[PDB]
Design an enzyme around this catalytic site. Structure first.
Site, PDB file in Angstrom:
ATOM      1  N   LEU A  22       0.816  -1.208   0.000  1.00 39.87           N
ATOM      2  CA  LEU A  22       0.000   0.000   0.000  1.00 39.87           C
ATOM      3  C   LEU A  22       0.850   1.259   0.000  1.00 39.87           C
ATOM      4  CD1 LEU A  22      -3.004  -0.676   2.311  1.00 39.87           C
ATOM      5  CD2 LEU A  22      -2.925  -0.648  -0.190  1.00 39.87           C
ATOM      6  N   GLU A  29      -7.571   4.877   9.010  1.00 38.84           N
ATOM      7  CA  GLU A  29      -8.327   4.093   8.038  1.00 38.84           C
ATOM      8  C   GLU A  29      -8.318   2.651   8.518  1.00 38.84           C
ATOM      9  OE1 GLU A  29      -8.444   1.630   5.427  1.00 38.84           O
ATOM     10  OE2 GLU A  29     -10.431   2.505   5.123  1.00 38.84           O
TER      11      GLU A  29
END
Ligand SMILES: NC(=O)C1=CN([C@@H]2O[C@H](COP(=O)(O)OP(=O)(O)OC[C@H]3O[C@@H](n4cnc5c(N)ncnc54)[C@H](OP(=O)(O)O)[C@@H]3O)[C@@H](O)[C@H]2O)C=CC1
Ligand SMILES: Nc1nc(N)c2nc(CN3c4ccccc4C=Cc4ccccc43)cnc2n1
Length: 203
Positions: A22, A29
């Site tokens: 990522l 999040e």
């Protein structure tokens, strides 16, 4: 066959990953992700648990200190019968087989009941979930920064071409489905502006 829910964090260019990883480090999040995939409405049966479905590349990319996602029933989808080596890590040939393993494994003779089913990702597993007649919900986190990725979400559900199929729900609906309150509006964590959205499709 209960409803399927898809959860994803993506840029505005639908990018969802860079080099099997990522391209961002968001702390707020990840908490959303876990609570959402872990929350179970009180009214449902007492031994209710959630399921997260994930691809093979998405499962090998999760650091051993993290996986398997705790408090949730984990299933890895793979077109290959290889060694998973788990504490009960189920694996199925596809979405439909996985659902069949669940219903068979978890039911009457079970002290464990299947609540909500989440497709946690992997580009390839996403397209499959998008083509499935049971997917109806999309929990989305939009990163308002066109980050450079090399993995993308298959359908542009936020663009105009699909506006008659996918409808974004108000935040009040987004909170109720999740049972708790969640940040409304942008959220700037380390030079990233993202927000939570929930889209629903008609069946
Ligand atoms: N930002 C976000 O929200 C998320 C991003 N990601 C990212 O996705 C990337 C991983 O790439 P990707 O290959 O797309 O990952 P996938 O999770 O799609 O895994 C694909 C692999 O899963 C199996 N698989 C996928 N679809 C099917 C299907 N329809 N039927 C049967 N088996 C299937 C395969 O088995 P086999 O290997 O045996 O062929 C395949 O090789 C990484 O960058 C990762 O970080 C992942 C989740 C969330
Ligand atoms: N809303 C939402 N939806 C998702 N599908 C989601 N996927 C991830 C993916 N990530 C990955 C993926 C690739 C490499 C590392 C890594 C590190 C940690 C974890 C931990 C748990 C689950 C996924 C994951 C993160 N954040 C998400 N947020």
């Amino acid at each position: 066959q209960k409803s399927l829910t898809l959860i994803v964090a993506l840029t505005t260019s639908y990018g969802i990953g860079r080099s099997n990883s990522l391209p961002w480090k968001l702390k707020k999040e990840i908490s959303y992700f876990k609570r959402v995939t872990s929350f179970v409405p009180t009214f449902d049966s007492f031994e209710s648990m959630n399921v997260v479905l994930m691809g093979r590349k998405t499962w090998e990319s999760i650091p051993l200190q993290f996986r398997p996602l705790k408090g949730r029933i984990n299933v890895v989808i793979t077109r290959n019968e290889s060694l998973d080596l788990g504490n009960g890590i189920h694996s199925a040939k596809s979405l439909d087989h996985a659902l069949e393993l669940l219903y068979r494994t978890y039911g009457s003779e079970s002290s464990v009941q299947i609540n909500r089913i989440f497709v946690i990702g992997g580009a390839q597993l996403y397209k499959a979930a998008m083509d499935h007649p049971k997917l109806d919900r999309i929990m989305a986190t939009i990163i308002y920064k066109d980050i450079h990725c090399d993995v993308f979400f298959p359908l542009k559900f936020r663009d105009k071409e699909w506006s008659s199929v996918w409808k974004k729900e108000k935040h009040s609906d987004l909170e109720s489905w999740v049972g708790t309150k969640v940040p409304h509006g942008k959220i700037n964590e380390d030079g990233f502006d993202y927000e939570f959205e929930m889209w629903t499709r008609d069946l």
